[PDB]
Amino acid sequence: GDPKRQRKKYETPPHPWIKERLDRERVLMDKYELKNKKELWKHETQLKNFRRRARRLLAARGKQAEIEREQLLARLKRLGLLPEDAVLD
Amino acid sequence: MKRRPRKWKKKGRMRWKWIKKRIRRLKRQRKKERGL
Amino acid sequence: EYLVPLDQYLAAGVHIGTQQKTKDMKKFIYRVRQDGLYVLDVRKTDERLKVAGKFLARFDPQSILAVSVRLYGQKPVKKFGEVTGARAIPGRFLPGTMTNPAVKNFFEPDVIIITDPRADHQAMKEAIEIGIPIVALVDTENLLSYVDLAIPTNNKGRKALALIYWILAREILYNRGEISSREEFKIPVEEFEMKI
Amino acid sequence: ENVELKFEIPVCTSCGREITPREHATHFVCPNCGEAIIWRCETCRLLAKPYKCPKCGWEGP
Amino acid sequence: ALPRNVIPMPRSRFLRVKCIDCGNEQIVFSHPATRVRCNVCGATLVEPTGGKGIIRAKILEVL
Amino acid sequence: ARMHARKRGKSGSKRPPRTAPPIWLEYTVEDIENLVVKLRKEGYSTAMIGTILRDQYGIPTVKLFRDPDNPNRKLTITRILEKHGLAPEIPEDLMFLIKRAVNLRKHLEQHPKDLHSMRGLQLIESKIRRLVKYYKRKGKLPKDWRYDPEQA
Amino acid sequence: TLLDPLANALSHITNSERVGKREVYIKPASKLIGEVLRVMQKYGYIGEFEFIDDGRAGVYRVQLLGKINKAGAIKPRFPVKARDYERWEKRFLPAFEFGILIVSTSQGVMSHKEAREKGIGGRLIAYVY
Amino acid sequence: SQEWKEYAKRVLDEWQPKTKLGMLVKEGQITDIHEIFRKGYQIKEPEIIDVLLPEVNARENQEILDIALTVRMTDSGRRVRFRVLAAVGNRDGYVGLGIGHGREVGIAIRKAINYAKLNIIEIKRGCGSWECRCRRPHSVPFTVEGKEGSVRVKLIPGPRGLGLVIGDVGKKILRLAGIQDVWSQTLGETRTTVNFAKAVFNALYNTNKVVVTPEMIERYGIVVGRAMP
RNA sequence: UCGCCCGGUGCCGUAGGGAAGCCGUUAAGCCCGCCGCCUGGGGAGUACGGCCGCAAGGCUGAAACUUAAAGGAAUUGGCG
RNA sequence: GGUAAUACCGGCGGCCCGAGUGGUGGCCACUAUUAUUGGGCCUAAAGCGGCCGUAGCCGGGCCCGUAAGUCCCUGGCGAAA
Ligand SMILES: [Mg+2]
Ligand SMILES: [Mg+2]
Ligand SMILES: [Mg+2]
Ligand SMILES: [Mg+2]
Ligand SMILES: [Zn+2]
Ligand SMILES: [Zn+2]
Ligand SMILES: [Zn+2]
Ligand SMILES: [Zn+2]
């Protein structure tokens, strides 16, 4: 078949002209002074991947799924985004 | 002849009993006039 | 037992029914005449009239409805309305009495008494829409749909509609302290029935 | 908001199925007794199902 | 209670008829399909007609 | 429903659940075996033996007694006949059906325009073959047997 | 003709209890039918039941309590591995433990909640909730 | 939370009640929204709701779903009419949907908003998804479905944080009732907003027809009406 | 002449279903089976090939191209 | 768009992405318009004019065996990227 392609690490919006969303993103760009929009969607994706990981280790059970569960907390609080007492939920 | 009852509806056309009779006459002419 | 003697229930015709049955009424029927006309029970008409009397003597007397659209059951509605404190509407029940607050005859009851669920179906529907108990006089032909307390009785003849409402009006008095004993009701039955 | 069983929901006395907010139900005090309140859901009123008071034994419509 | 639709039960009986010109005692069916005649003398006891037979002797029991 | 028509129909015989013979019976097993064998030698079909026992002799169905020589099976008329060697040489269901399709086949030879009767013949033959397939499968019929109408 | 005496029972039950009845008669009575009634009872969906013999395969009397929303048969009778239950529980039931899924495991008939405790599988026959 | 508590006192004085429920609410016998519902009463005054749930008219608990204008023919032209579709509700447990008509856009909106209050209902919330197993009133406690016209609607519970992924109008209705997370599956024609709106309303009502044991409640978090305002 | 059970043939009608007209134990309801057909309107049941028939004819059956609607059930009027 | 154009062509304002931003062709989702999950066939596309039957798919209750389908445990494999 075909060999590996390098892929984008962000995602665009499904519709480009929704008013109640242009209005919500116009605020986060003046408050933190980000350069363009593709700089903002990258952080949304960084968060949506964490969220989608916690949804699978939450229904799952097994031996290594346990090990994958507590590596998400360890980094996620090594990065300062959670405190030292936080549970998966 | 495998016909379909949507065409007996007469709204914007002519009658189908009379289109059949006219298709049959051409299927004849193509047969006799060197349909061999 | 036997609020009136049996020879008086039968003499009125409380027990005569119709030539049509129903699976609902199958417990109030008693037998079939060779003529093909069903006969009701009378022990049950009695044992239901007592319960209907001591259930109705618990409301405030100005919040009852008696209704009838037939013609033979209109004078027994007014006399029953006058003896107790109840309200009565004889004749046509014009719609929106319980649903339309834009009318002059607005009135919201607490119970409602229906003489015939078939002829008085407008008031029955308006009562369903409002959530109040329903006490109805059922004959061999009627259904018990939405009726909360039934009373099996020939609800068509002229002499039987006067004997039912008479007993009901007396037993309501005896259960709220207006009367000492049952033989202290000195109003003759002929005053209830419609004159020929 | 001070949840000490803030309320309860009523159930029909024939089938035991609790009652939805806007249906044509009814309630009334037990005839022949006077001590119990009796509920009837719309579907047990429409097809006339018997009930019986939980205190005395008086039955049915 | 216990509708007929569950555990059906017949409507026809076994009789203990007793002959006339023979005195003999027998058992027969109520809805026969043949011509039941006595087992010594030969006179008939029942007759076949559509649904239920029309017996011609004296009954002692219904069994 | 019925096999060829589709009417429902429900007429039939409704029996009481019961294990032992009734108390008012008096015919012992051997007295009933002799009765069963006596009638077959008057030329009676295995279906019309039971009718007579029930009507005249007062014996409810003979499937109330066990097999004398075997505790597993229960007594049935055909299992009495084969005890004495009188049982038919071909299942009598098949025989009744085959015999009923032989004088219809000589009626259809003088009236060949009776097109509504010759459909009943096709339906009878369908039944005969439906039964022969089953009998051949259960070994009641030898495999060198075929319904050939030109015989009999 | 007749092809499934278990499906007929479960549809009869869910048709009867939806109009308010309090007793049913499951006419052709296997012992698979009885085995599934046994586990519909322990989880509180029906009352008490008895086997009545009528000379021809027997009948079942069961009293209803008005405590079930829907019952039916999983017909093609798929097999399941002991670690692949959620894939089917997300297809038949309405929330993450709402009701039972009946399984014909190699040690009898039981609900999937007791199959996951031993870690076995089998054929799915029905579901109640 | 007071600006809507002097409104209650102002309305409760100059209002002359005309039905029985109004008498009860004025005499202080009925004093909470939760005890007018499961009894078979009738609600014909809109002031039973301006007094018991005052913040229903707060202009951010209101919504105008669509405005249409329709016509009938006559030998002297085309007689025109409006149709507004409105919904109201506090964002805790109570919602209502009504329509209302008129000859002008202003009268029609007034009738829409008025009839929305009389067709109010209370619902159940919880958390029934396989992914999020918290116990918090943020979604639908289990799968429910409702229908209207030619539209079929189904709602499925979803995890905490996911938006409300349903169509363009379902968000208004579902957000006035207090929900915040859901999934959806639709059939039929979803471009007639009246039938689509009434399907979503019917589903939220059917939330309370499912029989449930007292142990499911402390597994999904089921609350009815307000859940700790 | 009246009442009941089984099978056919009609009507009014609950729950439920449907876009409605309306169906409603003789389902167009909820289930378990098997087979046949449908995929925007025209071109077209046509052309080319095959098999049947004494002929008339039956059965099987496409594409180039062209078009934004063609169809259904019910409302208010105008009209005969 | 017919001599009073927010819709064409220019000026001046504004909006969306931004080292990019538009045009033409192809596949997937959109589409429950291919449907095992999961569609239709009275009036909209669509039940063979009717019936008989061969292969194939679907098949009543109980009891005793076998262990092919099926389920659990365990050895050898399914290259790296
Ligand atoms: Mg389709
Ligand atoms: Mg058609
Ligand atoms: Mg089997
Ligand atoms: Mg590899
Ligand atoms: Zn109930
Ligand atoms: Zn009582
Ligand atoms: Zn004799
Ligand atoms: Zn949650």
Coordinates of C-alpha atoms (C1' of nucleotides) in Angstrom, one line a residue, chain F residues 6 119 126 130 133, chain J residues 51-55:
Chain F
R6 CA -56.7 -22.2 3.9
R119 CA -57.5 -30.9 -9.8
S126 CA -49.4 -34.7 -3.9
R130 CA -45.7 -36.5 0.7
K133 CA -41.2 -39.7 1.2
Chain J
rC51 C1' -52.4 -22.5 -7.4
rC52 C1' -49.0 -27.0 -7.0
rG53 C1' -43.9 -28.7 -5.9
rU54 C1' -37.6 -30.2 -6.5
rA55 C1' -32.9 -27.8 -4.1

